[PDB]
Structure formats: C-alpha cells, structure tokens
Amino acid sequence: QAPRRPGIGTVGKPIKLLANYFEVDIPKIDVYHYEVDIKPDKCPRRVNREVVEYMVQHFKPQIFGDRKPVYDGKKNIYTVTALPIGNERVDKVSIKWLAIVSWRMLHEALVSGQIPVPLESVQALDVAMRHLASMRYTPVGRSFFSPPEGYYHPLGGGREVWFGFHQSVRPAMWKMMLNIDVSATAFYKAQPVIEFMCEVLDIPLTDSQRVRFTKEIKGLKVEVTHCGQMKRKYRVCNVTRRPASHQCTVAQYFKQKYNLQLKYPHLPCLQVGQEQKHTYLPLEVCNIVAGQRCIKKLTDNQTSTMIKATARSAPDRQEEISRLMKNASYNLDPYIQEFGIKVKDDMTEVTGRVLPAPILQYGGRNRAIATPNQGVWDMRGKQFYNGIEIKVWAIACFAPQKQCREEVLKNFTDQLRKISKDAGMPIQGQPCFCKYAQGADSVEPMFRHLKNTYSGLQLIIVILPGKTPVYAEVKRVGDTLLGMATQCVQVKNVVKTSPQTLSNLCLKINVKLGGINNILVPHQRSAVFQQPVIFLGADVTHPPAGDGKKPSITAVVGSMDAHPSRYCATVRVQRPRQEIIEDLSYMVRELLIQFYKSTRFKPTRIIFYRDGVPEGQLPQILHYELLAIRDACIKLEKDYQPGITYIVVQKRHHTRLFCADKNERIGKSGNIPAGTTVDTNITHPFEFDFYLCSHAGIQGTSRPSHYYVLWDDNRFTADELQILTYQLCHTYVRCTRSVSIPAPAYYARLVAFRARYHLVDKRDPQALAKAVQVHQDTLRTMYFA
C-alpha cells in the first residue's frame, strides 16, 4: 500500500547535526511470551506489580526457579527461556503459553529492508527496557516523574510542577534506537485542606463561592488517614448541590467526640466514603495524595507562568539530556543484563541540507521584490499587489466613556488613515458613524439599523473592553445573520499606538475585503503548475474532557485560483469522539463545483494535507478517506479520474535537532537555521517520510515537523515534494514571516476554532447544523483570516 522511497535529495548545502537517539544492539535469540490474569482487575497497576513481585519471590522453587521475569502490569509477562509447565491455565492467578517471539527475524527484517519489521518483538523489547524505571519512578502515560526536591515552582491554586523524562523505542535504518527527552507536567500539591480552602476561595459565604468550590474540587478523592493509614481512596464523581447532612448521628457524635463548639460549624461537608452506604467523613483534618494529575481547566496566567518556568535555550537542554543519560547507567541494570542488551551513551550524528528560499513579488507603481532573510522580511516601501479603496465605514465603541475620549479616537483614526494610505489601500474620508453602547444585548439592533440606513457599507470597527463576552455575539451576528465585515481591537492598543500594530491591522483588513497582498514569482515555482491543480486541507477537533454534550467539528478548505491566494471553507458537525470525517464526499464535491465556477476549468490533480491523526490508527483512516474522495469524484461526472496525493503532517513528537558546530548557531538561543531537511539515519527503513524545520525560533528549542506520504499517484520525486512544501510554507497572509506548517492546514484549524466560537449559546441536531452554517453573502470570502 504505502509507497517505497524513490531516492534521496540533492538540492541544498550540507550541515552537521546531533539528535537525541542512542543506539541499541540486540542479540539473536528467541524469547517466550506468556499471559497472566489478576482477579479482580479494578485495582491500579502498582498493586498488580507488587502482587506479582511477591508471588515470584515466594514461589521460586515451584514454578519459576532462579529466573527473572519481565512484567508489564496488566496481562503480559516475558521470560528468557521456556517455563517447563505447559500452555494450560493453572492456579486465582493463571498463566498459559501464548506464542513465540523471535529477534533474529527482526534483525534480518531491519538489515534487508525489503521486509517490514513485526510488532511483537518491538513490544517485547520496549517492555524489557522499562522494568527498573517503572519500579523506581512514577509512571504517567509514557513518562516518569519524580517528586520535586530542592526547588519550588507554584502556579497558584494548589498546583505544582514536576519534572521528568520520556522514553520509548523506535526502529531505524540498520538497527534500533532509544529516544530520550525532558518534560514537565502539572500535579496537585499535598497539604492540609484548610490552606487549600483559603487558596481556592481567594477572598455568610455566598452560594456562588460554594458552587465555585464544588466545581474546583470535582474529580478528586480524599483519603481517611486517622484510621491507621487505610489509604481508602473514595470514589467522588459528583457533589450534591444541597448538603445532605440535614436530610449515624452527626451533630451528637461530633459534640460528644470533640466536645468543642469551634468557630464556624456552618461549613458544609462533602459527600464521601460509600455514598450509597452514607458513611460521612469530617474535614477538620484532611489531606490529599501526591500523585494526582487531571486535565480539568488551564487558565492563561497559569499557562504563561508554566512557560516561564520550563523554557530554556538549546545548549542547556542538550547538556541536561546528556547528563541524564550518563546518570541512568543502563549497563548495570540486572534485567537488561539477563537478556544481554548493550546500549551506547552518545548522541547520533546525522547530516542535513538547507533548502533555498523563494522570492515574493509585490505590486504598485514600483513593482518591488522581497527576499526573505533568516525567515523574515519587511514591507515598508512596497505597495500591495491589489489594493481595495474604502469609501464608507463606521465606528462602534463598547468601552466606557471615561477610558476613551474623542481626541484619542481622532488621533487613532488619523494614524490609521495615514499608514493605510501609505501601504497602498487608501481609506477615504471621515467615518459616517461613531457612537457608544453597553452590554451584549445591544449588538443586533445597532447592526440592523446600520445595514438598513447606509446602502454601501464596507467595514465596521469594534472596540472591546478587554476580555468581554460580547466578542462571540458580535461574530455570530456578523457572520451567520446579516453578512457584514467586521474588525475588532482592544482599548490598550488605542490609547497607545505603534506602527507595527497598524501595519498588521491593514494586512488583515485588505484581505477581509477581497484583495491580494503578494504572489510567488511564476517562473521560480516548480513544474507542477503547468496544468490545473487544487490544494486541500482538513482538521477535526474534539470537545474537552468533562463535557459530553458538546459535539465534534470538522473543516475542509481549498484554493480557488492558480497563484494560489484565495481559499473557501466548509464546516460540519458529527458524533462526539470519532476520528473519521463522515461527510468528506459532499465537501469535496462542493469545493470542486466552486472551483469550476471560479476558474472555468476542471482540475486534473489533487493534493491533500490531512492534519494531526493518532499514529496507531492510520491504515483505516486512509482506507476510508481515499475511497470517499474517489466516490466524490465519480459522482460529479462520468469517467472523471484525477490523480490523488495523500500527505499527513505530525507535530506531536519528541525529536529535537541540535548543531554540531558552535559557529553555525543562529540567534540568541542558538537554534538550527530555517529550512533544514533530514531524511536519513533516523527515519523509517523502507517508507517515504522526512523532517523539515521551516521557521526561525525566537526562544526555546524548535520542533521540526514530520511529514509522511501515504498514497501517491503523480510519480513525484523526493526533492520536488520537499521544495513544494517549503514554498507553500511562505504564503500565509496574516504576517510577513514563515510558519511551521503549510497554509491549508493552518486555515482549516482557524475555521474549526471560529466554528466553535459560533456554536456558543451563553430538533437539537438540525438546530446545531443550522447554527454552524453561515450567511450567503460572506460564504465565498475569506472571513476566517
């Protein structure tokens, strides 16, 4: 199915790099795979590990001997040579022979390259290299975290930050590799509940405070400690709104045991400890566990604090990785020594290439040309390719009168007019409207009156007072109801003025009205553009945890010209928690119809850029989608067959690239330059994929993006596709920079988030499907950017 690599690239200049991959050499033996069972299985994995260790320690001279098993945690167990018992379930813990796993076959599959490698051997090796670390550290997902010591990084609200690393095993071209990278994740700090209460309260108590505390305490489990360290974690799923202590005497027992009246007996208790049995627990003396990690909600201030707490330059990260690898001491592990596995202790040396950058053509009276330098360029002194003249416009202010007077408004208007006229899109005359309003319930009549009175309205500017709930209402009224263009800006950018802010505002305004900023030079491009071509992109977003009523949202966008500069979008709503776009056929058919209407031609090629998908589910994704696209193609006309290319882009991994030479570090943080391509020595042995870093990082260490071709039909080479992706990375309209992923996927993400904003509400499924749909006037324009 998946095509084989047709070769390696040549275009570019060489560069020396280092990656965080440490080799592993495995011997050619045969391991025996068993299965174990634990009854009941409601308990966590740690107690299962303890029970299995106790059993293997106390049953050595009966069924195990002197042999050291490698355990998994749930069902699997491995042993170096066969247990002389049989394949029959026997005890309530059972074990039976299951299969045979061979490493010689894996070695031959890696060396030959024409034979794909299996998965049982890889799983066996991965379990083999994780017993001691999981025995000592605290596993969370696929990473090991250790409680902090010698430092303290609060986040506010009873949350702490713990550090650790991430380990996994991946195949390579001639042998196997081990992947290490540092990480950090928020946890719940351990402390008595009184200061937790005063922290979450952030100050008779208003019922709003009780509701907030009930919402913030959701999902935890308190543990009774005074009963001789029972560690009886209590299943808390929902706290009743009205306390049930008033509807096993409570007050009598309390006043007889503590014999004290205290100060605030009116505080409510929490329904805990076998709610069905109704065995209540006090909260005067209580604590929390030190291993709890929940998603819940993350705010902007906490996010910024965590970014400040975890960000560090590239050389520091490299030194920390090397120090951690030296400290691990994998060559003294008894379990690794039993199987006979040797591991290196140095980073892998790869060789990459730096691709050339394109040149962008502007317009105007001079017809200037801009050449990017280190992935950035400026516009000062250049006109737009196609400017739009603005004749009618209005101003609506939602900020209070005291914070924005008339003179500051006139100054801001004058500055915007001057800069816009300089850039090539002239704003003519004085505004025809300027007033003040208040509240979220006044947007609709105001916009309706403005639409009714002035016939030729072109743009409306709205000023918001910080973070306010009226933004969603403004967007909903503008898009799905009346169909008028809008632009928003905050007061803090009006009181003070900077040229770059106004330049970016003009950049957005011009394309919202139907203009073009810049295009690639036609002769600099590839040879694929000699015939009609269409570019597509898709994305799907899932609702956050806890919520179950919110559905999923999909999005597909496509180009409508040969530059390409213009895009159109479609959006739908589907069943919660599904990884398939169920309506791909209709979306693609509609996009093809619109392309034909705009261009007067029918495309002969299709390029698809699917956004992030899980790495373990791609075969059925491809199998369903490819058939869906072909089905959409066949319905439009008989015997119509365009070549299809399928590409998936991934940005969630743990691979980092550093510089071998000191002089070649660029910038403050010393990151790799923009445009480095790696496709050898760390990639799949016989498939078609590569790495690319097409943006210049500011702070921290950059993340290269992973591309993976699934189905190809146009007989492309490797360098052609790499150059095409790099060039498509340069056509983003919201800034004069280079972005991390191609334009169509980024636009699809923007469309999905805008639809999510549309769905807010401050017969049901048809109502949602109608709500997501937009008006006909703004349907075929670039409203999302």
The sign one gets for the Cα dihedral 235, 239, 240, 243 is positive
Q: Are 250 and 184 in contact (CB under 8 A)?
A: no
Q: Percentage helix, strand, coil, to 5, in the chain?
A: 30, 20, 45
Task: Give the span between the Cα atoms of 269 and 278, in whole angstroms.
Answer: 13
**To the nearest 10°, the Cα dihedral for 749, 754, 756, 760?**
170
Contacts of 732 (CB under 8 A, 6+ apart): 738, 739, 743, 746
Residue 434's nearest CA partner among 452, 455, 408 is: 408
At 200, phi and psi to the nearest 5? -80, -20
Among 479, 387, 393, residue whose Cα is nearest residue 433: 393
Q: β-strands 460-464, 534-541: how paired?
A: unpaired
Nearest to 483 by CA among 519, 506, 458, 503: 458
Structural fold of domain 387-513? Rossmann fold (3.40.50)
**Strand, helix or coil at 165?**
strand
Q: In this structure, are strands 486-490 and 460-464 parallel, antiparallel, or unpaired?
A: parallel
CA separation for the pair 93, 71 (Å, rounded)? 14
Q: What is the resolution of this structure in A?
A: 3.3
What CA–CA distance (Å, rounded) separates 629 from 225?
Answer: 60
- For every residue of 225-276, DSSP letters joined together read -TTTS-----------SS-SS----SHHHHHHHT----S-TTPPP---S-TT
Give bridge partners of residue 554 from the DSSP assignment: 540, 572
Using only C-alpha atoms, what is the Rg of the chain? Answer: 31
> Where are the domains positioned within the chain?
23-189+311-346, 387-513, 519-772
CB 676, CB 695: distance < 8 Å: no
For 299-353, where are the alpha helices, taking DSSP H only? 300-310, 314-328, 334-339
> May I ask the CATH architecture of the domain 519-772?
2-Layer Sandwich (3.30)
Helix segments in 59-176, DSSP class H: 103-112, 120-128, 131-136
Task: Kindly tell me the number of DSSP H helices and DSSP E strands found in the chain.
Answer: 20, 29
- Burial class of 707 by CB neighbour count within 10 A (0 to 12, 13 to 18, 19+): buried
Instruction: Indicate if the alpha-carbon torsion angle 14, 20, 25, 30 is positive or negative.
Output: negative
441 Cβ contact list (under 8 Å, min separation 6): none
Residue 172: C-alpha distances to residues 175, 348, 782 (Å):
6, 12, 43
Give the orientation angle of helix 743-758 with respect to helix 470-477, to 10 degrees: 110
Enumerate residues preceding breaks in the chain (C to N > 2.5 Å): 91, 203, 247, 762
Q: Is the dihedral of CA 390, 395, 396, 398 positive or negative?
A: positive
Which of these, 491, 299, 483, lies nearest to 403 by C-alpha position? 491
Burial bucket for residue 470 (CB in 10 Å: 0-12, 13-18, 19+): buried
**Order of strands, sheet of 176-188, starting from the edge strand that comes earlier in the sequence:** 138-140, 143-146, 159-171, 176-188, 21-25, 342-343
Alpha carbon distance 431, 34 (integer Å): 79
- CA dist 771 and 768 (Å) reads 5
Structure tokens at 221: 């489990």
The separation between CA 699 and the C-alpha centre of its own chain, rounded to angstroms, equals 19
Indicate which technique resolved this structure. Answer: cryo-EM
Cα 40 to Cα 92: distance, rounded to the nearest angstrom: 9
Answer whether 536's CB lies under 8 Å from 543's CB. no
Q: How far is CA 341 from CA 27, 336, 682, in A?
A: 7, 6, 21
312: number of Cβ within 10 Å: 14
Number of residues that this document lists for the chain:
785
Residue 431: partners with Cβ closer than 8 Å, 6 or more residues away: 393, 394, 395, 413
Give bridge partners of residue 14 from the DSSP assignment.
353
Amino acid occupying residue 486: T
Per-residue CA distances from 143 to 137, 316, 336, 386, 517 (Å): 9, 20, 19, 52, 46
**β-pair partners for 689:** 708
* Angstrom distance (rounded) from CA 630 to CA 697: 40
Write the single-letter amino acid at 55: M
- Grouping H, G, I as helix, E, B as strand and the rest as coil, residue 83 is coil
- Helix H or strand E segment including 411: helix 406-423
Q: How far is CA 228 from the centre of its chain?
A: 44
Tell me the CA end-to-end span of the chain in Å, nearest whole number.
Answer: 37
Q: How far apart are CA 302 and CA 159, in angstroms?
A: 10
3-state secondary structure (DSSP) of residue 51: helix
User: What are residue 441's phi and psi, to 5 degrees?
Assistant: -95, 10
Q: Virtual CA dihedral for 670, 671, 676, 682, nearest 10 degrees?
A: 110
Token pair belonging to 701: 């260490």
Three-state SS annotation for 495-511: HCCCHHHHHHHHHHHHH
